[PDB]
C-alpha cells in the first residue's frame, strides 16, 4: 500500500 | 482543480486515448509542425537580411537641411503666386501649402482662400486639382 513509500511527502 | 504546472483537458486525454498509437501520432505532428515553423523563420530572416542590405546608408545622403525662416504677416506677390500653384498641386492640404511658401502659418493660409477666392479664381483652381 501507499504507507510503505520511502520519504512520503 | 488540476495541479499547478500540469495540463490535463478532456479533449487532450480523449485525443491520446482514442487510438493505440494516437499519443505518438499527436507528438510527431507537433514535431513536424515545429520543424516547418523553424524553417519558415530561416526563410523570412534571410529575406529580411537582404532588405536591410538595400537600406544600408539610410537616407542621410538625400536629407535636406532644416529651414529656420520666421513666419511673416505681409503677403508678397511672389508668396501669392507660390500659394496659387500650391493650391493647384496640393488640394485643401493647408499644411503642405504653408511648408512650400515657408513664411505663412496655417491660420494665415486659411484666410488667403476667402480673401482671394474672387481675385485668383480659387474655386476654378480646386476644380482643376480634383480633375487630375
Amino acid at each position: 500500500p501507499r504507507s510503505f513509500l520511502v520519504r512520503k511527502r | 482543480k488540476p495541479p499547478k504546472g500540469m495540463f490535463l483537458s478532456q479533449e487532450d486525454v480523449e485525443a491520446v486515448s482514442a487510438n493505440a498509437t494516437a499519443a505518438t501520432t499527436v507528438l510527431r505532428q507537433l514535431d513536424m509542425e515545429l520543424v516547418s515553423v523553424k524553417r519558415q523563420i530561416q526563410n523570412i530572416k534571410q529575406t529580411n537580411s537582404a532588405l536591410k542590405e538595400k537600406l544600408d546608408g539610410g537616407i542621410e545622403p538625400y536629407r535636406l537641411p532644416e529651414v529656420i525662416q520666421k513666419c511673416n504677416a505681409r503677403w508678397t506677390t511672389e508668396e501669392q503666386l507660390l500659394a496659387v500653384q500650391a493650391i493647384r498641386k496640393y488640394g485643401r492640404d493647408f499644411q503642405a501649402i504653408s511648408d512650400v511658401i515657408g513664411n505663412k502659418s496655417v491660420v494665415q493660409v486659411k484666410n488667403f482662400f476667402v480673401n482671394y477666392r474672387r481675385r485668383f479664381n480659387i474655386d476654378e483652381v480646386l476644380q482643376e486639382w480634383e480633375a487630375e
Partner: protein, 661 residues
C-alpha cells in the same frame, strides 16, 4: 485528552458510536443523546485503562472500580461495554498476564489454517474465550510472511520490516507486551545514478516534486475527468501516468509552437515594413534628384521654376519624415524580436537522466504496492489512505519474528502440516493435511469451524494447493481472481565492517532502463551489525527469482562498489535472497488493489461460508468456514497490523456464533 486519545489509539471516533457498536447497542444509539455520551465515555475510559497497562488483563470488576459516577451508576451497561470490547479484541488482546486462570472445560473446536500473525492473533482470542484451538502450519516455523534471518549476531527480516507509525497502531500495544527494539527510520535517503554519482540536491528535489505532481494528476484524471475505463478495460495507474506524461510532453511542444509562431508573425511584420522602407528610399532618391535638377537652374527664375524647387523640397522633407517614423517602428520590432529569442520556452519536458530518476520514484511506488504500476487500479490503489497511522515509521532491531514467536506461546501448533483439503457441512468440518517431510502420512482434524488464513497467493494457485468441499461459491472465487497478489524480494548482505554512512538508513540506486527500475533500487541500514538489505521491486522481482544468489549478490556488490569505491566494499560473510513468488506457502509478498478490483473485494474475502443443509428442508445452518489475513482487511491491507486485526475480528465473529453474544 486521555479518554479521547484512547479512542484514537483504538481507531474509533471518540465522540460517535460506530456501525459495530450500533449493532451490539441498538437500544442506546436509537435513543437519547445523554445515554450515548455515557456509553461513549464508558467505552473510551475502559480502552484508556487497558492501553495504560496492556501487560495485565483488564477485568470487568477492575473497570467498574476505576469508573466515577454517574458512569459507574449502571453496572449492566458497563458490563455490556466491557464484554463487547473484550469479544472484539479492543481490550485484553495479544500477550497479557491473565488474572483469573482459563477454565479447564472448553466449548467448541476450531482448526486455524496457518500460524501467521492473522492465525496466531485469532488462536489466542479463541483459546482465551474458552474454545479448543489447533493451528495447522505447513512451515517448520510460525510467523509466515513475518520471517527473520538469524546467523550469530546477524539479524535481518526477509518479510515484514517496518511498523508504519504507532498512532492508532495495535502493534503499539504489542510492542509494550513483547520486547521489540523499535528504532525510528531517518526519512533522509540520497540517490546514486548508474555510474555511482549522487543526484545533485537541486535536481533530486525537482524530480521528486514532479513525481508527486504526476500522482496528484492521475488522481485528478480519475476523480474529476472520470478516466477510469478505456476500451472496455479498467484503467491502470501506469496507463494514467503514461497519459499524464504524454500530455506534459504535448504541452511542452504546443508551448514551443506558440512561441515560434509569434516570432514568424513579428518577422512578417518586419518584412512588410522593410519592403515599405525600401520602396520609400527609392522614391526619396528619385525625388532628391528631381529637386537637385530644379535647384541647378540658377536665378533669376520665373515663379513656376521657384515653385518647383519649393514643392520638391516640401515633398522630400515629408517622405524623409515617413521613413524616420518607419525606421523607429523597425527599431522596436527588432527589440521585441531579440527579446523573444532571449526567453524561449523549455526544450524538453524531462531529460533522459530526469526520466531515469523519475523511474526510481516509480520503483519506490512499485515497492510499496509490491506490483508493477500497470496492475494497480487507478481509482482504488490508495483506497486505504484515510486510515494510515500517525507518527514516525520504525524498524524491529530484534527481528519481527519476536512477535509471532511470542503470540505462539501456549498454543497447540502442528508445524510441518500442509492442509490439502477443507470439508465443511451442516454438522461440521474435516481438514485433511499431510506431513511436509513425508506426503504419505495423512492427518484428519474434525472441528465445528475452520478459520482460513491461507495467503491470497495460495487461494489463487491454479491448479489448487487446497481443495474446498464443497467448492467455494462464485462470489468468493471471483474476488480471489480479481484481487492482486504482489511480489517484493530482499537481498541480505552481512559484512565484517560498516563501509556506508551510519546516520543514513536508506539510499537509492537508479537503474539504466525503465525495464530494470526495481532491480536493487533501494538499500536499508536498520540493524546493529553491518548488514545492508537490497529490495527487488516491480517487474524485476518476478524475473530476478530465476537468477542465482551469486549473480544477485554480484549485481549488488557492483552497485555498492560504484558508490563507495572497490577498496571499501569487501565480500559479504553471509548473503540471503528471498523468493516469495516461488515460496508455495505465500505465492507472493502481499495484496494490492488490482485494476478491476476495489476495497469491496477485501470485504468479500472476509465474509464466511455457510454450508447447504445435509437433508433437504432442514433449517438454514450456521457458518462453518471463516477467512482472516491481510487480504481480508479493507482498511489495513498488506500489513502485519492488518493481519493482527483480521484475526481478532474472526475470533469475535466465531465466538459470537459458537459461544453466543
Amino acid at each position: 485528552s486521555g479518554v479521547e486519545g484512547a479512542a484514537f489509539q483504538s481507531r474509533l471516533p471518540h465522540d460517535r458510536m460506530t456501525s459495530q457498536e450500533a449493532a451490539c447497542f441498538p437500544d442506546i444509539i436509537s435513543g437519547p443523546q445523554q445515554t450515548q455520551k455515557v456509553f461513549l465515555f464508558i467505552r473510551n475510559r475502559t480502552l484508556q485503562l487497558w492501553l495504560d497497562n496492556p501487560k495485565i488483563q483488564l477485568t470487568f470488576e477492575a473497570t467498574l472500580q476505576q469508573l466515577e459516577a454517574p458512569y459507574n451508576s449502571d453496572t449492566v451497561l458497563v458490563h455490556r461495554v466491557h464484554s463487547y470490547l473484550e469479544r472484539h479484541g479492543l481490550i485484553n488482546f495479544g500477550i497479557y498476564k491473565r488474572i483469573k486462570p482459563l477454565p479447564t472445560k472448553k466449548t467448541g473446536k476450531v482448526i486455524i489454517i496457518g500460524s501467521g500473525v492473522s492465525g496466531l492473533a485469532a488462536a489466542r482470542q479463541l483459546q482465551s474465550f474458552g474454545m479448543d484451538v489447533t493451528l495447522l502450519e505447513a512451515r517448520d516455523r510460525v510467523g509466515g510472511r513475518v520471517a527473520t534471518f538469524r546467523k550469530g549476531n546477524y539479524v535481518a527480516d526477509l518479510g515484514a520490516m517496518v511498523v508504519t507509525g504507532l498512532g492508532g497502531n495495535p502493534m503499539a500495544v504489542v510492542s509494550k507486551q513483547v520486547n521489540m527494539e523499535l528504532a525510528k527510520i531517518k526519512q533522509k535517503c540520497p540517490l546514486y545514478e548508474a555510474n555511482g554519482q549522487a543526484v545533485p540536491k537541486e535536481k533530486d528535489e525537482m524530480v521528486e516534486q514532479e513525481f508527486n505532481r504526476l500522482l496528484e494528476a492521475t488522481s485528478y484524471l480519475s476523480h474529476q475527468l472520470d478516466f477510469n475505463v478505456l476500451n472496455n478495460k479498467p484503467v491502470s495507474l501506469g496507463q494514467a501516468l503514461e497519459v499524464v506524461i504524454q500530455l506534459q510532453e504535448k504541452h511542452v511542444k504546443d508551448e514551443q509552437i506558440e512561441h515560434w509562431k509569434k516570432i514568424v508573425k513579428t518577422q512578417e511584420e518586419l518584412k512588410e515594413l522593410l519592403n515599405k522602407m525600401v520602396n520609400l528610399k527609392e522614391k526619396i532618391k528619385e525625388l532628391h534628384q528631381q529637386y537637385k535638377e530644379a535647384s541647378e537652374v540658377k536665378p533669376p527664375r520665373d515663379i513656376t521654376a521657384e515653385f518647383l524647387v519649393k514643392s520638391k523640397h516640401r515633398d522630400l522633407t515629408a517622405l524623409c519624415k515617413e521613413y524616420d517614423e518607419l525606421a523607429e517602428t523597425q527599431g522596436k520590432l527588432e527589440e521585441k524580436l531579440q527579446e523573444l529569442e532571449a526567453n524561449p520556452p523549455s526544450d524538453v519536458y524531462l531529460s533522459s537522466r530526469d526520466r531515469q530518476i523519475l523511474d526510481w520514484h516509480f520503483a519506490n511506488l512499485e515497492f510499496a504496492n509490491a506490483t508493477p504500476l500497470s496492475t494497480l487500479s487507478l481509482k482504488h490503489w490508495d483506497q486505504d489512505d484515510d486510515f494510515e497511522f500517525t507518527g514516525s515509521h520504525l524498524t524491529v532491531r530484534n527481528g519481527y519474528s519476536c512477535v509471532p514467536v511470542a503470540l505462539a506461546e501456549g498454543l497447540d501448533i502442528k508445524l510441518n502440516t500442509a492442509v490439502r483439503q477443507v470439508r465443511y457441512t451442516a454438522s461440521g468440518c474435516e481438514v485433511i493435511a499431510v506431513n511436509t517431510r513425508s506426503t504419505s502420512q495423512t492427518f484428519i482434524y474434525k472441528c465445528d469451524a475452520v478459520l482460513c488464513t491461507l495467503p491470497l497467493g495460495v487461494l489463487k494457485q491454479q491448479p489448487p494447493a487446497v481443495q474446498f468441499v464443497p467448492p467455494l461459491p462464485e462470489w468468493k472465487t471471483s474476488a480471489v481472481q480479481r484481487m492482486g497478489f504482489g511480489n517484493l524480494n530482499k537481498v541480505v548482505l552481512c559484512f565484517d565492517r560498516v563501509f556506508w554512512d551510519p546516520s543514513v538508513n536508506l539510499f537509492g540506486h537508479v537503474g539504466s532502463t525503465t525495464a530494470s527500475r526495481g532491480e536493487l533500487f533501494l538499500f536499508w541500514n536498520l540493524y546493529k551489525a553491518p548488514i545492508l538489505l537490497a529490495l527487488v521491486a516491480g517487474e524485476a522481482a518476478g524475473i530476478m527469482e530465476n537468477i542465482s544468489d551469486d549473480v544477485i549478490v554480484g549485481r549488488c556488490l557492483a552497485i555498492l562498489k560504484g558508490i563507495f569505491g572497490s577498496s571499501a566494499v569487501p565480500q559479504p560473510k553471509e548473503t540471503v535472497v528471498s523468493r516469495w513468488r516461488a515460496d508455495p506457502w505465500a505465492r507472493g509478498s502481499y495484496s494490492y488493489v488490482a485494476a478491476g478490483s476495489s476495497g469491496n473485494d477485501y470485504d468479500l474475502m472476509a465474509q464466511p461460508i455457510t454450508p447447504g443443509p445435509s437433508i433437504p428442508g432442514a433449517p438454514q445452518p450456521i457458518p462453518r468456514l471463516f477467512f482472516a489475513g491481510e487480504h481480508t482487511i479493507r482498511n489495513y491491507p498488506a500489513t502485519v497490523h492488518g493481519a493482527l486485526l483480521s484475526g481478532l475480528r474472526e475470533a469475535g465473529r466465531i465466538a459470537d456464533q459458537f459461544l453466543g453474544a
